[PDB]
Every structure is written in C-alpha cells, then in structure tokens.
Design a protein around this nucleic acid. Structure first.
Ligand SMILES: [Mg+2]
Ligand SMILES: [Mg+2]
Ligand SMILES: [Mg+2]
Lengths: 40, 59, 59, 282, 63, 49, 46
RNA sequence: UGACGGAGCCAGCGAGUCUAACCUUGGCCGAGAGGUCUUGGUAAAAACUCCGUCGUAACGAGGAAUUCCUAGUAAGCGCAAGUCAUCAGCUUGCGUUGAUUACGUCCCUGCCCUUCACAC
C-alpha cells in the first residue's frame, strides 16, 4: 500500500557521527553563522 | 445562512452592523385590527400569487 | 473509522497508510484506538460526513 | 499604544503591497542602468516611456536580514519569555527550564490561567521581543511555537525524539556564555526565513573564544538541534554533548502574533497533496 | 561539564547515548547502539526479500 | 471527435449508498463534496472579514 | 522501515522516468527539427 | 474538613443541510433486492451557601534520594473544542475559588565580567 509521508528519522549511531563530524569541522575552520553587532 | 457570533456582532462599526429582526410575540393592536377581505377576494389574491410564481420561474 | 480492521495489530501494520473517501477527500491512518479493537484515528484534508465510505487501495 | 500598533501595522501592510507593485519598476530601472553602462539599445517599452526616463534622473542615486528584525538586528539584544500550556506536567516544566537555559536572555514564566490575548499584551508592554510556548503529551514535549513581537511572525514546530538533560546522571551545570551558532544546509528562501527567526533569538557578537556552540542542522526538513562544549587541542578539536537533543520540523508560519488566529499564513505544511513526500521545502 | 572535560584532557594528554535510571535502593541501555542493530537487521532482511521476489530457481547445496 | 470509437465514449454509470448504511443518507460524490467546501469557505471568508 | 524504502524507490523511479521522457522528446525535436527546417529551406529555394 | 437527600445560586470559550452505537427473538409484505414493525441483552457547570439524618490476598496518604515553584503564582473545580504537524490510553483552550513563604545576600555552590567638567 502507499504511504502519505516519510516516517520521522531515527537517530542511529551513524547519524550522530555524521552530525558530530560536521560540528567538528566547522569549529576547526572557526566558521560559524552567528549574529554580528552592527557598527555605530 | 451564516450566523455571526454575538461577540463579533456586538463590536462592529456603525456602518457595518447587521440588521437582525426579532419576532413579535405580544399581539399588536394593529394586527388585531386590520380587516382581511375573504371569499371572492381570496380567490383573487391567490391567483396573482400563482401568476407571479410562474413568471419568475420562467424568467 | 470502524470495520476496516479487526484488531489493533492489523492497524499497526497500516499506520500512515493513505486512504480516501468516496467523496475524494484524501486522508491518513494516524493511530490505532485501544478500545474497541480494530478502530483507529484518521485525519482528512477536510471534514468528512457519516454517509461517506473510506477506502484503502491495496494490491 | 494600541492605536499606534494598529496604525503601524496598517502602514507596513500598505508598504509591502506597494513594494510588490514597485518591483516591476525596479527591474525597469536596472535595464536602463545596464544599457547606459554597456551601450546596448533599450527595449521598446522602456524606449517609449518618457515618464520613466525623466524619473530615472532622480532615481539614479539609489542603492539581507528580514524586515521585522532589521530595525533591531544586532543593536538591541533579544528579550525572551519561555512559557507552557495550562496545568503543565512536571516533565514539561523541566523541559521549559532547559529551553530557558539554551537562550541566554530567556525568562521562565508560569502559565496558570493566563489568557492568551492577555499574555501577548503583557509581554508587548514589557518590551519582550520573542515568546516561546511549549506543549506536551504524557510528559513528552511535542510542539514548540516561537512568536516575534510586536507583529510576528509566529513559527510553530513539532519536536521528535526529545532527550532532556534531566535524563542524564551527574550531568552537571551548563555554561551560559553567548554561544556560537551553526546553521547548516538551509538553502531555500523558506530556509533563510527560518534561520533568521532562530538566529535573532541569541545575543549578538559572541566572544571568539566562547566554548559553547549551538548547531541547527537541517536533514530532510527535520532540523536537528544539538548543544556542545568544545576544547581546541594541539591536533584537532574535541566536543561533548550538553543537550538536549530534539528534532524540530516546521509546520506553520504566520504573519502575526500567535494570539491572532486570523493572521495571514506565510507558509503551511500540506500533507495530503499528491506530491507531498517528493520534495523537501527547507 | 566543560571544566570536567578540560580536566580529563589535560590528564590524558557524550552522556546522551546512554539511558540511565536512578537507583531506588545506573546505566540501563544503549539506544543508539541498539537501534542501529535493530534497524540494520531488518535492512538486510529487506534486501533479501527484494532479491527473492522474482526468482524461481536458487542454489540447492546438499553438502 | 477524431479517431475515437463510440464504445470509448460510453457512460460509466454511478453507484449508490449501501443498504446497510441506508439510514445515514445519500452517499456523497465529488460534485456533492465541492458544493459543501465552497459553501463553508464562502461563509468563513465573510466571517473573517 | 518499509515505508522509508518504498517512498525512496518511488521518488527515484519517478525522477528517472521524467529524465527519460525529457531526453527522447528533446532529441527528436533537435535532430528531426533540423531535417525539417533544412527541407523547408530547399523548398523555399525551389 | 465525612456519606445520603432536598433547596438556593453564579461563568466563559464553541454554530459546515453538520453530531454520531452493537448483537438478538419473531410477525407481515415483497419474484428478488429489500421495506416495515416486534422483541431481550450489552455499551454509553462544578465548587460554594442553607436545611435535615447517621456518625467518626491488598491497603489506611506513601521511606532514602531527587525535581520544580514567587501573584491572580501554587493548589482545588468543572465546561467546551479536537483546527493539514502532535493528540483521544489524550491534547489544547475557557471560566470559577485562590493562599503561605521570600522579593535580601553574594556566606556556600555554579556561571560571567574587569584589572569632556566637579569630586574620587
Ligand atoms: Mg496548576
Ligand atoms: Mg484539570
Ligand atoms: Mg496538559
């Protein structure tokens, strides 16, 4: 039978490791998307 | 037909206030007074009603 | 909904299945109801009526 | 107060309507500028529009964050109130506290018998910038709605696989520094809109050596939220979960405060359309 | 947590992957590890079914 | 009509409500549902205004 | 789990199918359209 | 700081020609389909005020540890709605009655910040 919507993703160990590496890379490069105070 | 909630109805601008008419229950004196012509005129008041009903539906 | 499934275990298999009424209102099987057996909850894109009949297309 | 907010919002709605009309004229001025610089002939409609050429003389000297946040983006820090549904269970109260600790300038307010129209009006007086309301089901958080004052937008989310810090033994206390923010894989115009709403909840200008990082990672429209504390080592960086974990999926976004159920819907989730599962909007 | 992290790292040179209860008189399980195995086992099972769908032969090894 | 048989353009007769459910009323069809949906939206639009 | 597999397979098959029809339609227009426009030019020459 | 009965009386949310059971015993009509009836079982504002009566196997308000909470808040009481995600093993709204204790301190525990006059 057909299903209307994709099931909610399951947080398995591999998914966490994928998330973990992305965070580690961004910190290492020190690139973050954060609000920057305007001048004046 | 749509029935506006009284809460919305109460706080409406003067230009847009829906005129909802309450039924009369105490018999008015004029309602107790008026004379209705019966018999021959009754046959001549139904008929005009019958004619106008056909004419609208035809149109 | 009722009479589609005979026990809640059947509904467990078909959770999330697409269903529609005769009227064309699409929907989903959300969850199985504990009481009575076989009843379940379904959410439709619009309000359905009692006269309507829900159908699950299976092969 | 009440008159000014009504008047200001009407002025905003009028301004947006004109800007949509003015978009065509803005494109036309761009074509004129390119032709003058490059030397290409103008299109026929522009070549014959005497009014535009005259008006171009004045308009030649004409030159991001979302409009609602533009006024105070990076100038005033946000002020946040985190509340819950009526008669909250104990677990939601603990969860509401965790959300309070997540945002540096959040305050936890008890919602016992507070009326929703009264709630926003009280918050608008006190200068509150954002309001967060949490819902629960048998002590498991299910929904989260974020409303930006004075006139919206209101973003509603559904929380899945929630794991609170209270479920951790000997976890310790958090650090409350201005955290670093990571927004990954937000590409569509809606995605940028969601990022802007979540970004402005935090104070501007975190210190460069701040050792707390918050990451919102979009993976198939299920925005994963994680909180970490990092230490820069000699051969890399090591990070540790502080929590909580939860995946939050947008399902509505309205141009108005959460009280106004009549607010125009900027975007909604259409679950029963035929091609619902095919495309991912965020 | 962060101060404890620094102390450990200077000595050397994720508590959310465990579900822990409270002793009424402690680590109870491994959700991430258990779900990976519980999801992978049905995953190879599904791969077997899709292979088995349209076959009438098969290798019969009596050894 | 070009390159089409008359058999192709045959009226498909449309069913009725089951006898077991006959109490509840007429089985709505798509045309019936459209009348409901438009009517509700028309009222809701004015009520919103 | 079966729900995840079925949806992914349907999307992939849908994506591949649309790719094929677009390919065979475009190739017919490009190559045969050239021959048509070539012939139309010869007839105009006549 | 009870149970039973009676009396008095007070809310606010909510308006899609839409709103809602199951299994049986039999009569009659009908070519059938079915129609109508008959029949047993199963299931499915409160607080508050006043008056009258009685009367004080498991468990009798829940250990250690741990969590939360500062005003229309905690707590008690019911009534509605189910609004494309979640929810009925329930969720969200609505009104009613409505407190005690703090509103100081950095002593302990954590987190954070620092090293254009006059007067200092
Ligand atoms: Mg309470
Ligand atoms: Mg209650
Ligand atoms: Mg609740």
């Amino acid at each position: 039978f057909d299903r209307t919507a994709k099931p909610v993703p399951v947080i398995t160990s591999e998914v966490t490791e994928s998330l973990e590496d992305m965070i580690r890379r961004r910190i290492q490069d020190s690139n973050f998307d954060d609000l920057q105070r305007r001048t004046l | 037909g749509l029935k506006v909630p009284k809460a919305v109805q109460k706080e409406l601008p003067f230009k847009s206030q829906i005129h909802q008419m309450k039924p009369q229950k105490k018999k008015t004196y004029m309602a107790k007074r008026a004379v209705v012509l019966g018999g021959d005129e009754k046959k001549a008041r139904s008929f005009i009603q019958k004619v106008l009903t056909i004419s609208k539906a035809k149109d | 909904i009722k009479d589609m499934f005979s026990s809640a275990m059947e509904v467990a298999r078909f959770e999330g299945a697409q269903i529609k009424t005769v009227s064309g209102i699409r929907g989903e099987i959300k969850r199985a109801l504990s009481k009575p057996e076989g009843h379940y909850r379904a959410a439709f894109e619009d309000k359905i009526l009692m006269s309507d009949i829900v159908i699950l297309r299976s092969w | 107060m009440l008159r000014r907010q009504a008047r200001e919002r009407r002025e905003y709605l009028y301004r947006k309507a004109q800007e949509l009309q003015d978009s065509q004229l803005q494109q036309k001025r761009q074509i004129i500028k390119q032709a003058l610089a490059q030397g290409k002939p103008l299109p026929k409609e522009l070549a014959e529009d005497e009014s535009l050429q005259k008006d171009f003389r004045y308009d030649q000297s004409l030159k991001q964050v979302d409009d609602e946040y533009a006024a105070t983006s990076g100038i005033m820090d946000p002020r946040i109130i985190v509340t819950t549904s009526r008669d909250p269970s104990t677990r939601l109260s603990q969860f509401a506290k965790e959300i309070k600790l997540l945002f540096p300038n959040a305050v936890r307010l008890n919602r016992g018998n507070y009326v929703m129209p009264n709630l926003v009006d009280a918050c608008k007086k006190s200068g509150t910038t954002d309001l967060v309301v949490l819902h629960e089901h048998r002590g498991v958080p299910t929904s989260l709605t974020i409303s930006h004052f004075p006139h919206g937008p209101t973003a509603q989310f559904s929380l899945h696989n929630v794991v609170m810090r209270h479920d951790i033994i000997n976890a310790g206390n958090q650090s409350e520094v201005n955290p670093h923010l990571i927004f990954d894989n937000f590409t569509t115009a809606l995605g940028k809109r969601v990022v802007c709403i979540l970004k402005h909840l935090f104070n501007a200008g975190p210190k460069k050596d701040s050792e707390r990082v918050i990451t919102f990672a979009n993976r198939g429209d299920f925005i994963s939220v994680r909180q970490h504390v990092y230490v820069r080592t000699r051969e890399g960086v090591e990070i540790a979960e502080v929590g909580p974990r939860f995946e939050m999926r947008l399902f509505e976004l309205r141009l108005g405060t959460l009280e106004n159920k009549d607010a125009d819907v900027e975007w909604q989730l259409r679950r029963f359309i035929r091609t619902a599962n095919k495309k991912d909007y965020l | 947590q962060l101060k404890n992290l620094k102390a450990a790292l200077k000595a050397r040179g994720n508590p959310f992957e465990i579900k822990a209860a409270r002793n009424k008189r402690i680590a109870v399980g491994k959700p991430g590890i258990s779900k990976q195995i519980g999801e992978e086992q049905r995953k190879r099972a599904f791969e077997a079914r899709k292979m088995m769908k349209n076959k009438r032969g098969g290798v019969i090894d009596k050894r | 009509a070009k390159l089409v048989h008359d058999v192709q353009k045959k009226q498909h007769r449309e069913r009725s409500q089951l006898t077991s459910r006959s109490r509840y009323g007429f089985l709505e069809k798509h045309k019936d549902y459209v009348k409901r949906a438009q009517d509700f939206h028309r009222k809701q639009s004015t009520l919103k205004v | 789990f079966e729900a995840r597999q079925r949806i992914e397979e349907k999307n992939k098959e849908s994506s591949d199918y649309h790719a094929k029809m677009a390919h065979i339609v475009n190739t017919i227009n490009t190559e045969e359209g050239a021959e048509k426009n070539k012939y139309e030019r010869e007839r105009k020459l006549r």
